[PDB]
Design a protein around this ligand. Structure first.
Ligand code: CL
Ligand code: CL
Ligand code: ZN
Length: 306
């Protein structure tokens, strides 16, 4: 299992594991902050190990970039390492309340291998600190901004921004070598959210998965790609709705435009059915995402195949 621990700047690191989402790490004067937890407390052990190869400081703050189980269910591992708060936006908190249980069951059923040692998961991760717009932590002298600048990947998407070093942890708002999972997306709002991230002027950006982007040209390529992906996806959904297509026809129409431009990115085929399904709903006027459950997955595959 290939693990990559990348020092991005004086105080910022990215943690990547083959096939897993990225986690972000900020080492402040007094304490460590992480962005997303890895999928289980058993998997969190190796992120802790990487952090402890650098510092003995308490892992005081655990930020959830959004509510999805793979991002949050490792949170309880960090208590013994010094966690004082699990931080989430109001939107993320609302999603945990509304569909945390359903999403936990859904994600573990879909991709059990993402949840190594799933028996170590104690239950849902409940934030202890919920913010509306923006909080700033001073880790000694190090300023860390935790911000909701708009929704996209989910209602409540949260970013972590290190202004002094221009390091942005985008959660799943930004991708580059992988497709966007849009099953819970607010597709209409995502382009404006991407432009808000562009206005930050990041020199380093940790995307949802894959290697970090290490200069502004790479940052903007990731922003442009993600914007193109989610704009095209929603546009094809509006076309399917205008034409009264069923889901199989909507998938074929979406592929017309998405496959040439994006068909090469990692996990494209895994994500595309959920993306077409969400785009069709949202274009149909379902602004708040339907909840994904096993029976909805089953009906989706049935509609797409036979
Ligand atoms: Cl606030
Ligand atoms: Cl449904
Ligand atoms: Zn996600």
């Amino acid at each position: 299992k290939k693990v990559t621990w990348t020092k991005l700047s004086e105080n910022a690191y990215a943690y990547t594991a083959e096939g897993d989402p990225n986690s972000g790490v900020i080492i402040g004067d007094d304490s460590v902050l992480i962005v997303d937890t890895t999928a289980t407390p058993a998997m969190a052990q190796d992120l802790i190990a990487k952090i402890r190869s650098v510092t003995d400081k308490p892992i005081k703050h655990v930020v959830l970039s959004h509510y999805h189980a793979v991002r949050v269910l490792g949170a309880s591992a960090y208590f013994d390492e010094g966690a004082q708060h699990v931080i989430a936006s109001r939107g993320t908190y609302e999603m945990i309340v509304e569909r945390g249980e359903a999403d936990m069951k859904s994600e573990i059923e879909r991709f059990p291998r993402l949840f190594a040692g799933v028996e170590t998961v104690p239950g849902l991760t409940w934030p202890t600190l919920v913010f509306e717009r923006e909080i700033t932590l001073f880790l000694g002298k190090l300023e860390v901004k935790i911000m909701h600048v708009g929704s996209g990947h989910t209602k409540g998407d949260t970013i972590v921004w290190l202004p002094s070093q221009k390091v942005l942890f985008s959660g799943d708002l930004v991708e580059y070598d992988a497709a966007c999972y849009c099953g819970d997306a607010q597709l209409e709002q995502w382009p404006a959210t991407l432009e808000a991230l562009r206005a930050l002027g990041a020199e380093k950006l940790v995307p949802g998965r894959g290697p970090a982007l290490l200069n502004p040209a790479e940052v903007n390529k990731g922003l442009d790609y993600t914007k193109d992906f989610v704009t095209t996806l929603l546009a094809q959904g509006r076309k399917a709705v205008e034409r009264n297509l069923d889901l199989k026809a909507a998938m074929a129409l979406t592929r017309e435009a998405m496959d040439p431009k994006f068909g090469h990115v990692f996990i494209y085929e895994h994500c595309l059915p959920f993306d077409v399904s969400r785009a069709f709903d949202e274009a149909s006027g379902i602004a708040h995402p339907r909840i994904w459950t096993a029976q909805r997955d089953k009906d989706m595959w049935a509609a797409l195949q036979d």
